[PDB]
Amino acid sequence: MIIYRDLISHDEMFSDIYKIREIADGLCLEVEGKMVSGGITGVDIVMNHHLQETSFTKEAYKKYIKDYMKSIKGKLEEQRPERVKPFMTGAAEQIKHILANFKNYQFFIGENMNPDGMVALLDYREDGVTPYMIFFKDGLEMEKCLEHH
Amino acid sequence: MIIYRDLISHDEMFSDIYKIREIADGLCLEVEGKMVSGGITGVDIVMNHHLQETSFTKEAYKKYIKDYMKSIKGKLEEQRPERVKPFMTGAAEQIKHILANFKNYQFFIGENMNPDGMVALLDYREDGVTPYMIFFKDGLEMEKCLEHH
Numbered sequence: 001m002i003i004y005r006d007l008i009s010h011d012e013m014f015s016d017i018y019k020i021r022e023i024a025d026g027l028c029l030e031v032e033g034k035m036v037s038g039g040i041t042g043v044d045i046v047m048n049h050h051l052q053e054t055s056f057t058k059e060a061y062k063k064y065i066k067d068y069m070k071s072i073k074g075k076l077e078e079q080r081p082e083r084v085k086p087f088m089t090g091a092a093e094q095i096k097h098i099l100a101n102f103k104n105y106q107f108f109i110g111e112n113m114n115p116d117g118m119v120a121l122l123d124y125r126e127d128g129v130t131p132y133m134i135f136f137k138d139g140l141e142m143e144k145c146l147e148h149h
Numbered sequence: 150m151i152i153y154r155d156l157i158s159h160d161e162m163f164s165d166i167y168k169i170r171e172i173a174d175g176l177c178l179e180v181e182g183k184m185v186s187g188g189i190t191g192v193d194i195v196m197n198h199h200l201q202e203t204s205f206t207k208e209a210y211k212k213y214i215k216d217y218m219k220s221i222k223g224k225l226e227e228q229r230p231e232r233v234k235p236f237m238t239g240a241a242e243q244i245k246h247i248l249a250n251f252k253n254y255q256f257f258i259g260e261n262m263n264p265d266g267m268v269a270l271l272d273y274r275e276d277g278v279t280p281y282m283i284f285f286k287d288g289l290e291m292e293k294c295l296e297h298h
Contacts, residue, residue, distance in 0.1 A: 001150070015150065034185040034196070035185065039183060039279065044183065143296060143297070145292055
């Protein structure tokens, strides 16, 4: 299995039990979930990794995402400088889209709700039933769990 | 995350995203799943780890489980001899129950369908909707995936 963790908060965000693909020129990972009927109707990604639904006002989100982008920029400068300009430019466009469509998404954070961690988006496919979630790829750290005996 | 793999086949059987408890005096792990409606109705454990439904006749199963018990006994003799008698005695009782209730379970094997690997059982809770699966604990190997940076 491969575990995808929030770079900043260390919370596990998802794993490769889901269909995953890169979107937005490598800026984002799209993670397709399943609707669960057993117990309480919900999105398996959210239940499985204990993601917490969150809310905020646009002014709060603007303050948060500016600091988040700074944190990721500093990590990319230190470790992968070739990603700094694509991330800053691509993320700015994604963030403008989010703010223009703000009431149309649900927002989730890792189980431990660290304010400096990543906020992920939940949307549904055009079939109205299939959920999927969007994450900043530069804000994730992979752990490969392949029988490190 | 913690990954539970078939000792013998190496296939991943489940992980600790599910509710897990020990049953039958430590002989078995019980793994509670969720029903999934998105796409094709099924049990998330089965879909997530690509478990394969299997069938057989009682005579085939009797031949298989006798060899499987031998394989696990040999592993316990070599590595955990204090488990040999509890496993052989406890498994014999579980197997008699399975054979007496043979048409009432669904049987699953790991993704790669190794004939020497573990066969897991799928049942439903008394609510008729909540699935759960039963595995021999002595036939599993844990991998702890906890940020081995």
